[PDB]
């Protein structure tokens, strides 16, 4: 069913397993989860948003850029974007995790979104991941 | 003299003033300094190093990738890299800041290095900035 997600992203994965990896919560399967991709995606997003703010607010001091970036690159914002993509429908987690409300946990939603951006960067490069991420941000925060 | 720094960076600036900008400490001139470029470059470097480690340590958990990144992306390491480029020789700062040892401060050296990488990213893009940054990192710190 991940095809629906690809359509929402405007990005079709060459390696489908890579998207599944990004969608795999830590509860699901031994030694296979989205934590490394989330690490990579978070670094991607800090550059995407930092660069965006640097250009958009040419007169803003570093402190302003930093705080504005914190206001965008965070669990709440990413969980919002995740929900706009119905990510809870695609994330893989154990029965117990789902019964404990995992599909609605902001951390799980946020982590999966960041891992997806990491996965797009891995497969397609920074500039591509940037264009995808900026579209999602501009649809959710029309700043 | 600036050509010497470019030679050390193995990168020739298209816009020379951009490099000047990256080299301008906050003490030097009102409303013009390297702090915004440092912010941008720090983000570039966190991605360059995060990606490098992600691939180099394909098995490592996030905690281990983060520790390895902290071993590279830090003031002490960046100041060492800056010193390898003789960066203190090129940083612009007030007389007072210079007399107070500013060209020798690891924070100032690190900031200027990160600002230079930000500037390269700005004019040439991420992949070029990544190439330059990794050369500097590997020339200094092949053990990580
Ligand atoms: Cl991975
Ligand atoms: Cl600037």
CA separation for the pair A3, A85 (Å, rounded): 12
All residues of chain B having their beta carbon less than 8 Å from the beta carbon of residue A51 are 40, 43, 121
C-alpha B9 to ligand 1 mean position (Å)? 32
Question: What are the beta bridge partners of residue B92?
Answer: B24
Q: Is B11 exposed, middle or buried (0-12, 13-18, 19+ CB in 10 A)?
A: buried
| DSSP state, residue B141 | -
Min distance B6 CA to chain A CA atoms (Å): 24
CA separation for the pair B127, B47 (Å, rounded): 11
C-alpha A36 to ligand 1 mean position (Å)? 5
Pure H helices in A57-93? 62-72, 75-84
How far, in Å, are A44, A91, A101, A104, A122 from residue A97 at the CA level?
Answer: 28, 11, 7, 11, 28
Backbone phi and psi for residue B36, each to the nearest 5 degrees, phi listed first:
-65, -45
CA separation for the pair A19, A12 (Å, rounded): 9
Burial letters for A52-75: b for 16+ Cβ neighbours within 10 Å, e otherwise?
A: bbbeeeeebebeebeebbeebbeb
Residue bearing tokens 């700043």: A143
Burial letters for A10-38: b for 16+ Cβ neighbours within 10 Å, e otherwise?
A: ebebeeeebbbbbbbbebeeeeebbbbbb
Task: Find the CB nearest B51 among A40, A62, A65.
Answer: A40
CA separation for the pair A129, A22 (Å, rounded): 14
Resolution (angstroms) stands at 1.3
What domains can you pick out in chain A, each with its CATH number? 1-143 (1.10.1520.10)
Residue bearing tokens 């966190």: B46
User: What DSSP assignment string belongs to A89-131?
Assistant: GT-B--HHHHHTTGGG-HHHHHHHHHHHHHHHHHHH-HHHHHH
Which residues are CB-neighbours of B34 under 8 A, at least 6 positions away?
A: B21, B22, B23, B24, B25, B26, B111, B112, B115
How far, in Å, are A115, B20, B28 from residue B25 at the CA level?
Answer: 37, 10, 6
CA separation for the pair B108, B115 (Å, rounded): 10
Q: Strands, E, within chain B: which ranges?
A: none
Method used to solve the structure: X-ray
Q: Do A36 and B65 touch (CB under 8 A)?
A: yes
CA separation for the pair A126, A124 (Å, rounded): 7
All residues of chain A having their beta carbon less than 8 Å from the beta carbon of residue B51 are 40, 43, 121
* Contact predicate A54/A65, CB 8 Å: yes
C-alpha torsion sign, points A71, A72, A77, A78 = negative
Identify which of A82, A67, A75, A60 has the alpha carbon closest to the alpha carbon of residue A139.
A82
* Contact predicate B46/A44, CB 8 Å: no
User: What DSSP assignment string belongs to B38-77?
Assistant: HHHHHHHHHHHHHHHHHHHTTT--HHHHHHHHHHHSSHHH
């Amino acid at each position: 069913n991940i095809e629906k997600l690809e359509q929402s992203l405007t990005y079709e994965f060459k390696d489908k397993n890579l998207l599944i990896h990004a969608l795999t919560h830590k509860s699901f399967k031994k030694s296979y989860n989205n934590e490394r991709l989330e690490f990579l995606g978070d670094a991607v997003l800090d550059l995407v948003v930092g660069e965006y703010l640097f250009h958009k607010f040419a007169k803003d001091a570093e402190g302003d850029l930093s705080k504005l970036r914190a206001a965008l690159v965070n669990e709440k914002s990413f969980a919002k974007i995740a929900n706009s993509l119905n990510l809870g429908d695609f994330i893989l987690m154990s029965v117990a995790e789902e019964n404990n409300g995992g599909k609605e946990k902001p951390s799980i939603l946020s982590d999966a979104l960041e891992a997806i951006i990491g996965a797009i960067h891995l497969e397609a490069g920074f500039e591509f991941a940037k264009t995808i991420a900026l579209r999602l941000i501009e649809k959710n925060f029309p700043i």
